[PDB]
Amino acid sequence: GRLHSQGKGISSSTCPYRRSAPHWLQLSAENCVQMICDYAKKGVRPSQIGALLRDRNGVGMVRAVTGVKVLRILKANGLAPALPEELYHLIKKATNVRKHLEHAKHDVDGKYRLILIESRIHRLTRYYKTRRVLAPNWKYNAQTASALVA
Amino acid sequence: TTLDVDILHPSVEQELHTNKKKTLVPNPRSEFLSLRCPSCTGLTTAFSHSNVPVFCKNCQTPLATPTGGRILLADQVEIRPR
Amino acid sequence: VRTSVLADALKAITNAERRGMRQVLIPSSKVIIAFLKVMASRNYIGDFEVIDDHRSGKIVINLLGRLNKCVAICPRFDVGLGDLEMWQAKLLPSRQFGYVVLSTDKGIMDHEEARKHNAGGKILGMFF
Amino acid sequence: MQNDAGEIVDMLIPRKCMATDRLIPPHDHASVQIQIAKVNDDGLPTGEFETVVFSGYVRALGESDYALNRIATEKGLLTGVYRNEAH
Amino acid sequence: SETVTAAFNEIAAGKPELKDLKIESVKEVKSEGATVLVITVPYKQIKAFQSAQATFLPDLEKKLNAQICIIGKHRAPKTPEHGRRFKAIRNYGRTLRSVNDAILDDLVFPTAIVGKRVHYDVNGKQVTRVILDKHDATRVEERLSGFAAAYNRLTGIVSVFEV
RNA sequence: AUACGUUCACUGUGAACAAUCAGGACGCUUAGAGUAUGGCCACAUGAAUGACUCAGCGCAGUAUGAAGUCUUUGUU
């Protein structure tokens, strides 16, 4: 957590050393492509989809089944989200904290942290417009915030 | 003993004591536990850390329940290593 | 941020040699592995193990205890044979030992090799 | 150091530490030169010694104890001692 | 050869799974103790072989008096050499490094790998040092020399295999 | 279908581009200089080379460092 902050974090997952396996379990390449697409129909973000398979269907790495990452499977079938997931959550956070700063405007700690989210988005939207996921003409305003999250 | 430490082939103690990432091969300390309520006879897989509270097919109450680290085993429930 | 590896790693090896350790733990690369290989030919170092973790890598050096500094200078200056014998006089302490690792077109090799092959290039650092 | 037509030049050669392998200069008076009596099986002295050396750096840290364990067991003057166990 | 090709087609009789499998080629090796056979398969067919596999391999190994290590045709050059077709940009799968590392996970299939490393010597020369998972073998303990010969044929590399 | 299948940067090599500076030859009586001068029978010479130098130009080599690579499906 080093970006907009004082602090040096180190805390995350570490992938298992062997991508292949495990023979001991029991799962299939074709059956797992159905189950990913199962949840994405009902409106879940790929960050949560892998976690449901981990905690229901004992799927450690989903790659280690299919040979394929989760977002590729959705885009292969042709049914991912339109916005990136990291971008979606920030604009959904930033519209909510701006809703708060209407009501009571004295918390400058709210204002200071409205920037540093609004700042984070303008970094990401640049990155995604290079990869050509969002078209040049796409924008983020206060008026256009609720249109994109919905 | 600051100068001499053997770091190619360390002890079994020292691999467990060092951090998840700091080991010579990095790989996690967390595995899929098999589980069983003595009510049922159906053998349920689960991820030890979780996030989601675990149920079997049949009953209703969660088999394991979420904290920070490992799953908190509610009731008398047991683990079969497989 | 890790600006450079070959720069960083040779600092850590030097801090082992001052202290007088037996072995060191360096994220690995393909220039760092070649830089260690070229000083292994001149017998400044022992013999080392470039381990896998499906990741950047690690190296475990085995120190022989015969080495005073590894620099790695940057930015990577171009140097060409007629121009080179200035960079010996600046960088090394003596004339009569210590080598200047530069990545010639053929590969990364001492100055003593590079003048034999008749190929200059960009320089990485030195050792002595 | 060598004159190269032939010969050897320079006067004196500093002895080298067995632990660290650095040079022992003239003036580091914390430098040490041990003698240890090698013995025949059944503990009989053979009138033949091993001379272990340390520099004043290695003694200053603390670690010249632990080198004596390592060096003696390499030469074959101890058993156990070096390598395990705590607990 | 058509020792293994004749041997495979007779034991393939009566099985739905082994009905469409094919072998390209094979390379025998000098293994000190016995010999070993290294049987190449057309890439898309690997997981067809490798889905069950352990039914028929004991029968094939016992008949020819030799170990059998099944392998994919993994092929991969950055600079055109001629007599070969090369993608300009190339791909990671296409490159040699992926090929040589994909080859291991075929060769010793059923155990999978815990560790891998190199050892660079004072001379300069290099010795790979693979470590098999300490749980699967058991069996892996018996065939270690066979792999050291077989892997040295395919990739050119001096390896060893240990627990 | 015996030459063609990324260009650069960088390196080597090649082209291209007075005096002074460095440097070779020669006892201006020496020196700073100068381009001479040495052989008694009509002869022999020398007036080199490098640097001046970044850019622009060619072939050869690819270790390092770049660009090249429109994908809810691209190329012939």
Q: What is the resolution of this structure in A?
A: 3.3
DSSP bridge partners of E128: E118
Q: Backbone phi, then psi, for E31, in 5-degree steps? A: -115, 20
Q: How far is A54 from chain B (nearest CA, A)?
A: 7
Measured from the Cβ of residue D9, the count of other Cβ atoms closer than 10 Å reads 8
Interfacial residues of A (vs B; Cβ cutoff 8 Å): 10, 13-14, 16-17, 24-25, 51-52, 54-56, 58, 60
Q: Which residues of C77-104 are buried (b: 16+ CB within 10 A; e: fewer)?
A: eebeeeebeebeeebbeeeeebbbbbbb
Q: Give strand letter and number of the nucleotide nearest A78 (CA to C1').
A: F72
Query: Do B34 and B56 contact (CB within 8 A), yes or no?
Result: no
* Measured CA distances, E47 to A59, A76, B23, E16, E155 (Å): 20, 22, 33, 15, 22
Q: Which residue has the tokens 């040092």?
A: E129
Burial class (CB in 10 A: 0-12, 13-18, 19+), A113: middle
Measured from the Cβ of residue E160, the count of other Cβ atoms closer than 10 Å reads 15
CB contact E121 to C (< 8 Å): yes
Question: What is the third-level CATH fold of B1-82?
Answer: N-terminal domain of TfIIb (2.20.25)
Q: Which of E93, E73, E76, E96 is nearest to E84 (CA)?
A: E76
Give the tokens for residue B12.
């079994």
Report the distance separating Cα E19 and Cα E12, nearest Å. Answer: 6
Residue A6 belongs to a domain: no
DSSP bridge partners of B66: none
Measured from the Cβ of residue B35, the count of other Cβ atoms closer than 10 Å reads 20
Structural domain span for residue D65: 1-87
Q: Backbone phi, then psi, for B64, in 5-degree steps? A: -135, 160
Which residues 52-81 of chain D have a CB within 8 Å of chain B? 61, 63, 66, 70
- Sorted by sequence, the CB contacts under 8 Å of residue A2 that are 6+ apart come out as A8, A9
DSSP bridge partners of C62: C23
* Domain count within chain A: 2
Report the distance separating Cα C123 and Cα C79, nearest Å. Answer: 7
Q: Is D9 helix (H, G, I), strand (E, B) or coil?
A: coil
Q: Is A147 helix (H, G, I), strand (E, B) or coil?
A: helix
Measured from the Cβ of residue C108, the count of other Cβ atoms closer than 10 Å reads 22
Of the candidates E116, E117, E120, the beta carbon closest to that of C40 is on E120
Edge-to-edge strand list for the sheet holding E130-132: E113-115, E130-132, E161-162
A119 and A58 in a common domain: no
A73 and A101 in a common domain: no
Structural domain span for residue A92: 81-150
Mode of pairing for the β-strands spanning E25-30 and C121-123:
unpaired
Question: Which sign, positive or negative, has the C-alpha torsion A76, A82, A87, A89?
Answer: negative
Query: Do D25 and D14 contact (CB within 8 A), yes or no?
Result: yes
Q: Which of E93, E137, E149, E129 is nearest to E112 (CA)?
A: E137
CA of B41 to C1' of F35 (A): 116
| Structural domains of chain C ordered from first start | 1-67 (3.30.1370.30), 68-128 (3.30.1490.10)
Q: Which of C65, B21, C46, B6 is nearest to E122 (CA)?
A: C46
Report the distance separating Cα E157 and Cα C40, nearest Å. Answer: 21
DSSP bridge partners of C104: C121
Q: Is E127 helix (H, G, I), strand (E, B) or coil?
A: strand
Helices A70-77 and A46-55 cross at an angle (nearest 10°) of 110
How far, in whole angstroms, is CA C93 from its chain's centroid?
Answer: 16
A96 and A31 in a common domain: no
Q: Which of the 8 DSSP states describes residue C44?
A: S
Q: Which of C24, C35, C30 is nearest to C59 (CA)?
A: C24
Mode of pairing for the β-strands spanning E66-72 and E126-128:
unpaired
- Domain segments of chain E as ranges: 1-163
* Domain count within chain D: 1
DSSP bridge partners of E67: E36
Q: How many CA atoms within 13 Å lie on the side-chain side of A57?
A: 16
Report the distance separating Cα B2 and Cα B25, nearest Å. Answer: 23
Q: Which helix (H) or strand (E) holds E66?
A: strand E66-72
Q: Is D75 helix (H, G, I), strand (E, B) or coil?
A: helix
Q: Which helix (H) or strand (E) holds E57?
A: helix E57-64
Query: Do A33 and A73 contact (CB within 8 A), yes or no?
Result: yes
C106 touches strand F (CB under 7 A): yes
CB contact under 8 A, B3 and D63: yes
A140 and A105 in a common domain: yes
Looking at A37, A60, A80, the residue that finishes a domain is A80
Q: How far apart are the first and last CA of chain E?
A: 33
Task: Report residues 56-85 of C contacting strand F, contact meaning Cβ closer than 7 Å.
Answer: 76, 78-83
